[PDB]
Amino acid sequence: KLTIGLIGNPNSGKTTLFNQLTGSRQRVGNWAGVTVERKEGQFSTTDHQVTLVDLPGTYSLTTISSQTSLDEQIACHYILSGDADLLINVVDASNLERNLYLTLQLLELGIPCIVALNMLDIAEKQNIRIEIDALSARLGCPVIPLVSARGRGIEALKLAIDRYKANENVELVHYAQPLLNEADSLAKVMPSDIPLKQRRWLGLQMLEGDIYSRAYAGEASQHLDAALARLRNEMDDPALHIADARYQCIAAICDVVSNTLTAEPSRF
């Protein structure tokens, strides 16, 4: 038996993939404490009986700008609740750079994950070519091309689920040493139920100015002002650096991964 969480952007073809996997074997209700719909369904692999949980559409698990989205909170809450044994991240190939911000957050949290590259046919109309193994090597998790024809992308996805394992601990984003040391101090006073790696993540998001992470912080929210001011002795703007270090990482990956599909040559 298994429980998998389906996660991705609003326009990533996530809902369509859910229906194709589960089919008629579905159940409907709502998330705890709200009227927002919660779909669940089941399908079988060679070994496992999978229980697919459809999460709401989301671009990011965090937010700044004082803008709240209940769909994002519900998504982030389920991820941190550790209910699912595995996650399937639906990624749009025609908007890779934008979609990878969510993908990165799932990998930083240490959640076992399988990326499903969707809308490859639309990417080819944009003159875009995706390097699959180059992407997989940098993310440290398997990347399955979700081929529509004959539902053979679903078969490859089921094959990946039976082989699933802990993600390869690669170097994703390269933050500054003071930010990591300060985020670790916030992790000490955070509640001990949450894993160490996830506590360090939460504390890093608090420094950038996240509002969702403060719900799981506890007494660490009181130490934030002292910790944030302490970082400004070394760095000019901590919040700016975290955004740049994150952008730099994704920009580096997209340079290698996203290539031009076809072009008429002008030289020999």
Numbering used by the authors: 3 to 270
List sentences from the manuscript.
Structural studies have also illustrated a large conformational change in the G5 loop of the intracellular Ras-type GTPase domain (NFeoB) of the prokaryotic iron transporter FeoB, when comparing crystal structures of apo and nucleotide bound states. We have used the EcNFeoB (Escherichia coli FeoB) protein as a model system because of its clearly resolved conformational change in the G5 loop as revealed by crystal structure analyses. We systematically mutated the residues in the loop to alanine and characterized their biochemical properties in order to determine their individual roles in nucleotide affinity, GTP hydrolysis and GDP release.
Given their drastic biochemical deviations, we also validated the integrity of the S150A and T151A mutants by determining their crystal structures, which illustrated that the mutations did not have any adverse effects on the overall fold of the protein or on the G5 loop. All other mutants were determined to have slower hydrolysis rates than the wild-type protein, with the T151A mutant being approximately four times slower than the wild-type protein (kcat=0.12 min−1). The most drastic biochemical changes were observed for the T151A mutant protein. Interestingly, the release rate of the T151A mutant was too rapid (>1,000 s−1) to be reliably determined using stopped-flow fluorescence techniques. A threonine residue is also found at this position in many Gα proteins where it coordinates the nucleotide base in an identical way. These stabilizing interactions are abolished in the T151A mutant, resulting in a ~4-fold decreased GDP affinity (Kd=33 μM) and a GDP release rate too rapid to be reliably measured using stopped flow methods (>1000 s−1). Indeed, the stopped-flow fluorescence data indicate that mGDP is spontaneously released even before the competing nucleotide is added to the reaction. The data also indicate a weaker affinity for GMPPNP, which is further supported by the reduced hydrolysis rate.
